[PDB]
Swiss-Prot record, chains A, B:
Gene: isdI
Entry's localization field: Cytoplasm
Protein source organism: Staphylococcus aureus (strain N315)
UniProt keyword Lipid biosynthesis present: no
Record carries keyword Iron-sulfur: no
Subunit (UniProt): Homodimer.
InterPro entries reported for this sequence: ABM_dom (IPR007138), Dimeric_a/b-barrel (IPR011008), Heme-degrading_MO (IPR050404), IsdG (IPR023953)
Name recorded for this polypeptide: Heme oxygenase (staphylobilin-producing) 2
Length: 110, 110
């Protein structure tokens, strides 16, 4: 059975990557979900006009991720999150997000 | 100083993801580079008319990744690799590749 990866890709106002990444330091319940394995928060290195921050989560299965998506802890973690496009999103540097999903065909860990 | 991620993104002809992923099962020395931590090989779940396979490598530093790029094992691992557009690559299902680089601002493993 294959592991699974979900990515949330955040398009951010230029210069806002660091303040955004720091919002992820404190866990808000994902660690309680059966099948959750790893989380990475990355800044893309490039010369673009907007920053890019990605949240990669690694799971035992896609079903495990879907259970998290349906969970109270997902909703809790995202309670106060806004997009710049939201009616009350004036202070948000997050222009948009897009979700990508992946089957993991192979993994090696030293 | 942060962990570092490099991605090689393979654009593949439709239906060739599995045969391409299986080429990565056999280690060819990347694991011997100081600073190498993890490798993932993923198939993107989408409805597009090309397959997409991503090779994600996780490192203690960007320096260690560059050291691997410059190594004899990188060259040996890739010596027989061709793109379809190469003179001797007609049967290769690999259409193109693109490299992406990321600073890891946060990591968690359960
Ligand atoms: C693919 C998975 C996924 C999705 C769909 C998603 C949906 C969205 C989304 C648009 C719907 C936006 C704008 C954000 C933005 C954020 N998410 Co997520 N997030 C996701 C993965 C995560 C993860 C993982 C965490 C940490 C959860 C925890 O329990 O620690 C998170 C928490 C956050 C945080 C930090 C917590 C806070 O500020 O209180 C921000 C900012 N976000 N996320
Ligand atoms: C960003 C990192 C990176 C780059 C730039 C890169 C450059 C390229 C590239 C562009 C010319 C192409 C078409 C490929 C395609 C392949 N690479 Co890489 N590869 C990379 C990460 C990897 C990794 C990691 C392995 C396994 C190495 C090992 O030692 O096990 C690999 C090995 C392979 C293999 C399987 C080994 C084999 O069939 O013998 C294919 C196919 N490839 N790679
Ligand atoms: Cl997120
Ligand atoms: Cl590759």
């Amino acid at each position: 059975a294959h592991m699974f990866m979900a990515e949330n890709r955040l398009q951010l106002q230029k210069g806002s990557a660091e303040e955004t990444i720091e919002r992820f330091y404190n866990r808000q319940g994902i660690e309680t979900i059966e099948g959750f394995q790893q989380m990475f928060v990355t800044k893309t290195l490039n010369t673009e006009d907007t920053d890019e921050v990605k949240i990669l989560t690694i799971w035992e299965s896609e079903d495990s991720f879907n259970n998290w998506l349906n969970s109270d802890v997902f909703k809790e973690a995202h309670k106060n999150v806004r997009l710049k496009s939201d009616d009350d999103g004036q202070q948000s540097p997050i222009l948009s997000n897009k979700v990508f999903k992946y089957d993991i065909g192979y993994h090696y860990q030293k």
